[PDB]
Ligand binder design. Structure first.
Ligand code: HEC
Ligand code: HEC
Ligand code: HEC
Ligand code: HEC
Lengths: 240, 240
């Protein structure tokens, strides 16, 4: 009936992946027809399962993930690579089970200095080395803008598009490892990245049912936006 | 070949839909197995097309959209309803064409007071009117938290669960209108919502090629985060 689907909800069969292969295809996918972060990462997971094991994986409308490029048509929201990777988890597991998987993928992203991946000369943007940094944000605007600012590189530069291309690979690689670990540990799976400090402490009031201050939703690290930093001071007045 | 898909990229045949139908369906879909905002929205478009026209629409793994519940596994990033609705656009059109569609849907969401949709006695979460407001953000965290704060409503209440359900309906409604208009107008589609003030004013420096300060990526309204409001001041020291 209505709301149901071919194969049932979360009824696809997961298959272990080769993280190295994934990082690679994700990076390549990123440049393909200029589809981007979401497409490359998504494809490196479900796309590779399709090439090796056929249906249902190979029946997916892959380019739909172009939607996530630039945090969804340049709105700079969720980093496309992150969505593309986490979305695949929902093809196999449901809400309760996917939560710790995305928590690990997302918390890892906030703290790890990236990119790590290097295509060598398979580089389609700029060959070379790129500065690494921890974004402390799963949001594209924050991740990209901070890095460009800090490194005096333009968000239009071939470098930042090379950077996002490599990040797609790192996220693909990490997501792949998480999928593998999930297949192994079954319903025992646990995130290896503990809850963020700010999330836990602020959460005491803002994310605890019954609390008079329990208004907030979202477990992104609170630090970037709620720290009174120069960046978050009023830029609409006296801002050269 | 690798990276291609059944039907070619953006190869689906779009069909006009009834906005009021989608709104109703999206609202139901929202509660179905607790799948949420992204599931209802996406389904009310592609799902209905499946029910009414068959393959390929009816072949889609709908439950994957549960990935988006609560701003992606409770992370509070892009609102599930917005992503779910926008995603559908990429099944029929390429990024060039989709950009103005997402721009209108997202801008519409920022400036419009919601929710509008009212299931009356058919409310599946909690019956009754709900306070409306413009979020100024396509991010579930800012949208929800600010609304709970300003109305003193726990983010864990049925009231807010009901609000997000209604919001899903509004989003689905608007996306259908956009899709319909896009079908009629073809390559001449233009968004009714213009670029936000802060984005083009701040963008003059930050999102313009060649300018030293060209570091930012993202066309979200800059006001909530770069205004030095009470909210963005340091909440880590002397708070509350
Ligand atoms: C409970 C002991 C709290 C902790 C821990 C933190 N906050 Fe809080 N916050 C609390 C209350 C009761 C209130 C409202 C009344 C008031 O004191 O003004 C707030 C309000 C906020 C706001 C609103 C804007 C403001 O005026 O400050 C924000 C955006 C907010 N709190 C953020 C926040 C963050 C991110 C925290 C951790 C770093 C944090 N609060 C902890 C109660 C408590
Ligand atoms: C930036 C992307 C943010 C992150 C990460 C977190 N919050 Fe936030 N929060 C942000 C803004 C710009 C706003 C809107 C403020 C406004 O104009 O109303 C909010 C709002 C909240 C609120 C509600 C009170 C309010 O000022 O509206 C709370 C209680 C809050 N945020 C808490 C908070 C905590 C505890 C977070 C970490 C898990 C968190 N926010 C992250 C921007 C951002
Ligand atoms: C050009 C005339 C600009 C306009 C208009 C705005 N910004 Fe800006 N910004 C510009 C420069 C050259 C710099 C360099 C540092 C400085 O203070 O001179 C910046 C920097 C920022 C920053 C980060 C650095 C900081 O002050 O902490 C942010 C967060 C930023 N700008 C945001 C921003 C927004 C939101 C604007 C509109 C309200 C805005 N800027 C306009 C140049 C120009
Ligand atoms: C909140 C959800 C945000 C919105 C909407 C916009 N920006 Fe932003 N911006 C925000 C944060 C938390 C940061 C990181 C600050 C840090 O600690 O480094 C940024 C960063 C930028 C930058 C880079 C410089 C920097 O301070 O790191 C710029 C130039 C900037 N933001 C500009 C800007 C403009 C013009 C926006 C609207 C189109 C905009 N930001 C929205 C948070 C958020």
């Amino acid at each position: 009936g209505r709301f149901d689907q071919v194969g049932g909800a979360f009824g696809w069969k997961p298959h272990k992946l080769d993280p190295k292969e994934c990082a690679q295809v994700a990076y390549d996918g990123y440049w393909y027809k200029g589809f981007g972060c979401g497409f490359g990462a998504f494809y490196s997971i479900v796309g590779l399962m399709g090439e090796k094991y056929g249906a249902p994986y190979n029946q997916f409308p892959f380019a739909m993930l172009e939607a996530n490029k630039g945090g969804i048509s340049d709105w700079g929201t969720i980093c496309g690579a992150l969505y593309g990777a986490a979305a695949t988890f929902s093809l196999f597991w449901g809400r309760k089970e996917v939560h710790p998987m995305v928590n690990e993928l997302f918390r890892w992203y906030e703290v790890t200095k990236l990119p790590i991946f290097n295509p060598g000369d398979a580089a389609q943007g700029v060959k070379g080395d790129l500065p690494m940094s921890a974004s402390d944000s799963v949001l594209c605007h924050i991740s990209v803008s901070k890095w460009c600012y800090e490194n005096k590189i333009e968000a239009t530069s071939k470098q930042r598009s090379e950077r996002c291309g490599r990040l797609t690979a790192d996220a693909a690689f990490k997501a792949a490892e998480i999928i593998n670990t999930k297949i192994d540990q079954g319903k025992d799976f646990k995130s290896t990245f503990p809850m963020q400090a700010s999330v836990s402490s602020c959460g005491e009031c803002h994310m605890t049912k019954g609390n008079d201050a329990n208004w907030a939703k979202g477990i992104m690290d609170c630090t970037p936006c709620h720290s009174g930093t120069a960046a978050t001071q009023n830029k609409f007045v006296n801002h050269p």
